[PDB]
Amino acid sequence: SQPSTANGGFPSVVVTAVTATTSISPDIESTWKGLLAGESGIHALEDEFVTKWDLAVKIGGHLKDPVDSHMGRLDMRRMSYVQRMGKLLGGQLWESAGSPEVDPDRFAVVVGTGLGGAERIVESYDLMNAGGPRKVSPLAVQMIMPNGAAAVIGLQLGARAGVMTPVSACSSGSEAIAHAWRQIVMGDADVAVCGGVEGPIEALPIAAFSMMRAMSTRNDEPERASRPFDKDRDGFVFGEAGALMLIETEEHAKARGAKPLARLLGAGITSDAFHMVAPAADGVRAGRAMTRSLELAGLSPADIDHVNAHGTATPIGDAAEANAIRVAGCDQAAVYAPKSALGHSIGAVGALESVLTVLTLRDGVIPPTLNYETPDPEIDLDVVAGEPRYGDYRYAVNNSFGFGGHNVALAFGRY
Amino acid sequence: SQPSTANGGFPSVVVTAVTATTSISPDIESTWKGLLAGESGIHALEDEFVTKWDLAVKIGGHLKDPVDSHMGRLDMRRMSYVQRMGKLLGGQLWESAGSPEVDPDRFAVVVGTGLGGAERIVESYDLMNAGGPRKVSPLAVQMIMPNGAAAVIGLQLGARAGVMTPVSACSSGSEAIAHAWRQIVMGDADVAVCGGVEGPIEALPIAAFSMMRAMSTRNDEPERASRPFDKDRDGFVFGEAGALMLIETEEHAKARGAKPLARLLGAGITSDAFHMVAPAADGVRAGRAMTRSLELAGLSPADIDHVNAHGTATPIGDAAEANAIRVAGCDQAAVYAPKSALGHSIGAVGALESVLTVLTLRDGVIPPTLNYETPDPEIDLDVVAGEPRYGDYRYAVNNSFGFGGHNVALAFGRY
Ligand SMILES: O=S(=O)(CCCC(F)(F)F)Nc1ccc2cnccc2c1
Ligand SMILES: O=S(=O)(CCCC(F)(F)F)Nc1ccc2cnccc2c1
Ligand code: NA
Ligand code: NA
Numbered sequence A, B: 001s002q003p004s005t006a007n008g009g010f011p012s013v014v015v016t017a018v019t020a021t022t023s024i025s026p027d028i029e030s031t032w033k034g035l036l037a038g039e040s041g042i043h044a045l046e047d048e049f050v051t052k053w054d055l056a057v058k059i060g061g062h063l064k065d066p067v068d069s070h071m072g073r074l075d076m077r078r079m080s081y082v083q084r085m086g087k088l089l090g091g092q093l094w095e096s097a098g099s100p101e102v103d104p105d106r107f108a109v110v111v112g113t114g115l116g117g118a119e120r121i122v123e124s125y126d127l128m129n130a131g132g133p134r135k136v137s138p139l140a141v142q143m144i145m146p147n148g149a150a151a152v153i154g155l156q157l158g159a160r161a162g163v164m165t166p167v168s169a170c171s172s173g174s175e176a177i178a179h180a181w182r183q184i185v186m187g188d189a190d191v192a193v194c195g196g197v198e199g200p201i202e203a204l205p206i207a208a209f210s211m212m213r214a215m216s217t218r219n220d221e222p223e224r225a226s227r228p229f230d231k232d233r234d235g236f237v238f239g240e241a242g243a244l245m246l247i248e249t250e251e252h253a254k255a256r257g258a259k260p261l262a263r264l265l266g267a268g269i270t271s272d273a274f275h276m277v278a279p280a281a282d283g284v285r286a287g288r289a290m291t292r293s294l295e296l297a298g299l300s301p302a303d304i305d306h307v308n309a310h311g312t313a314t315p316i317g318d319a320a321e322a323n324a325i326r327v328a329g330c331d332q333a334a335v336y337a338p339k340s341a342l343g344h345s346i347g348a349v350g351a352l353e354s355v356l357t358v359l360t361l362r363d364g365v366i367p368p369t370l371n372y373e374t375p376d377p378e379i380d381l382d383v384v385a386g387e388p389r390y391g392d393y394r395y396a397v398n399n400s401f402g403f404g405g406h407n408v409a410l411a412f413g414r415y
Helices: A028-036 A048-054 A073-078 A081-096 A117-131 A141-146 A148-157 A169-185 A204-211 A252-253 A284-297 A315-327 A346-364 B026-035 B048-053 B071-078 B081-096 B118-131 B140-144 B148-157 B172-185 B201-209 B250-256 B284-297 B315-328 B344-363
Strands: A012-023 A107-113 A190-196 A244-251 A262-271 A305-310 A334-336 A395-403 A406-413 B013-021 B109-111 B191-196 B242-249 B260-269 B306-308 B334-336 B395-404 B405-415
Touching: A012 A028, A012 A169, A012 A346, A028 A346, A048 B191, A073 A081, A081 A141, A081 A148, A081 A244, A081 B395, A107 A169, A107 A346, A117 A141, A117 A395, A117 B118, A141 A148, A141 B013, A141 B201, A148 A190, A148 A204, A169 A190, A169 A244, A169 A262, A169 A346, A169 A395, A169 B148, A190 A334, A190 A346, A190 A395, A190 B201, A204 B118, A204 B306, A244 A252, A244 A334, A252 A406, A252 B260, A262 B148, A284 A395, A284 A406, A305 A346, A305 B148, A305 B172, A315 A346, A315 A395, A346 A395, A346 A406, B013 B026, B013 B081, B013 B172, B013 B344, B048 B140, B048 B201, B048 B260, B048 B344, B081 B148, B081 B242, B109 B148, B118 B140, B140 B148, B148 B201, B148 B334, B172 B191, B172 B242, B191 B284, B191 B315, B191 B344, B242 B250, B242 B344, B260 B284, B260 B344, B284 B315, B284 B395, B315 B395, B344 B395, B344 B405
Parallel strands: A107 A190, A305 A334, A305 A395, B109 B191, B306 B334, B306 B395
Antiparallel strands: A012 A244, A012 A262, A190 A244, A262 A406, A395 A406, B013 B242, B013 B260, B191 B242, B260 B405, B395 B405
16 A cells, blocks of 8 residues: 555645746746747857857757846856856746745755856866966855755745755756655655756857757758657757746645645656666656656556657657657657757756646646657657647646656646 | 654665775775774875965875776776766675675666766866867766766666766765665665765865865874864865765565665755855754654654764864754764764765764774864864774764755664
8 A cells, every 4th residue: 555646645745836937938928828829949049159169050049038137246256057047036936926934944945957057167267277276266166066056046045944956967857846746745845946947058068969969950940950759850959948846735835825736746767777878769767757657646547648758859869758658658648849849958948848747737738849740650649739739638747868867757737 | 643764654774785985995894994093094185286286275185096097098088087986886886785686677876976077077168179069079968967977877787766866065975875765765766876976186176165265274284184073173174085885675685685784764854044155053954954864763862872973174064063963962972073084075975974874883883083182162062082982872873064055864773
């Protein structure tokens, strides 16, 4: 008689607020409406570094509204980028939540990132070489450490029931939400701010990722380069993003009159032990990740109406996920690959895509998967394309698969 | 009622093997004998970079046995230092546990770290500035990503029940152990490889932490510089380290004839939300990390015989920890500050001090806190000093407190 959300073994956890900054818009609800209208965030990069280095990739989605356009001189001096993004999203999230007065002792922050304050390592390196060890800021360490974002958000909001930073590359954002859920169901907290943040698009990131040969080079037509599950896909597209959601026990959200957006029912974490950067082709462990989220939710595969696919738009990546969705027996669910419109935000993407899974369940709609024009004959899923599909989505699984063979799956339900 | 290890709510988890590379020795058992003999791995740094920059800190503990002396030309070109450490310790641990055949679908890896593959960031940055984006390695991303060490260990040992990497600075190693324990009691695995790994001593690391005023500069007596809880303390000393342990359910241990070295009973994670690098002076949330560890273990503070303190030798750090142990009502316990001997491993250190906490319970002996000469009235603790302290220690807490206000306590028990 193992514990599940269904059988009361875990307390009921609800999502009571969300925030995201995006290539389409700084406002999640605008981003949502824009996705339903079939808008894409992916453009031709106009940054000088592109033409300075003659990079193979000249496309991506910068945030519609730069994080640093909201950051004064002080904040530019004492925070890394992911920190400054985290402070911004943290404040937006709380205001959206009605600036609630919670017990800081029962309040956790779990925010993942791909890399950390990496640019401050480079800057400290350059300053030290030009002028010696005393040119390194006494702030260098607090900005460089990859727990910086979560620590800045925790300090900002007064989270005293734990501040955590899981790192698993592309799945970091989803993993953070998994761990926030655990922290609540195990009794360590009643409310948790969780999600992901990531750095902007730049020369060195593109260089690194494009030399892996995992990126689309369809530079002629930016808006059509991201092609999850399409026969002509040639890898992923950068799409800057950041996302937090507020979760709390249903008791808690009720005690303060907060109207839930959805339920976070269960969470699955597994691994491939196959390759450092390529997903196991059989999708077996990735599927178990999904199956596990259902065990803890108390759901069976037949209950899943929707799947928010990883949808990297790599050849081997989409084939792998196809096999996973079959292995978990969720292949009759309506699939959506939001990376088609928003692109890959690495450490942030798993949390943005959880925010879309929540809204999907709230509004009862899945936006269209852009650029799905020649479905891959070797992949037989129900990819939503063309126009938004209004459906009775009671339960969804959001997938995330990280470099290192990390598999995370989040089980969500309608309120 | 609430599930506690004592009341059978969580399955009994056991430590069945351990491994560490330290400044005293590559062989953990040799390190443990040297600590009881009163030895110190902190020597004067002979490194060129000391002289080139004339660093204020000229003292530190390199590994007795450098990682790269065991590493081929291909590994040196294909992995980040921390991965190379992770591979080496993963193999040593596996061998020490008798190379057991385990179900990969119930076998997790949780290895934390401080920074990640940082050297690959600067190197990639330098190569690209030199000869353009083509000069960045196709392996750059897997080497840089902080989850890289955890990944490599998971792939080397075939862990498929999840590979995870918590980053919480100085507490990363202890946090890795806390999540592996969770992974097991929530039922996601039966056997975990967990601990932490960290990069070597170098110019920028010393500049970075020096400039916070965090580090001891007592260069003329390197083996006396690290003075946890002592009146004349003046900051921490770098001591290179990596540490891993094998934990598993008692049931799983029994069934393969593995001899338990100790029990892992409970794990608390709290946060100060006080300051980015200063611990809260009151020690309340720190102590509540200890308290939480005992709730889950089913112990009362009165049952705690030993505490394996953070003991960084920072003036404000030790003060706060002393109050933390007072709030946890564990201030009756025989206290040890291993950093006195082995220095500060940052990411690794919690993993290391967790292993030393195991061997303390196994052998009924606490080593002496080196350089404890002038009791601080602000620290009213029973700090073990002078001669080892022998006794029937049944229950021990291992404290870690990271920059960013992350507090990890681990409840351990004699087998
Ligand atoms: O994976 S990353 O390299 C880029 C991700 C890009 C995008 F997908 F669009 F989000 N992460 C970071 C992290 C910190 C950085 C700080 N300064 C400059 C770039 C950074 C990129
Ligand atoms: O905290 S760190 O800066 C120094 C480690 C401290 C200690 F281990 F205790 F000595 N971490 C790293 C990480 C990666 C590195 C790769 N190459 C050079 C140095 C590195 C330091
Ligand atoms: Na997804
Ligand atoms: Na300790």
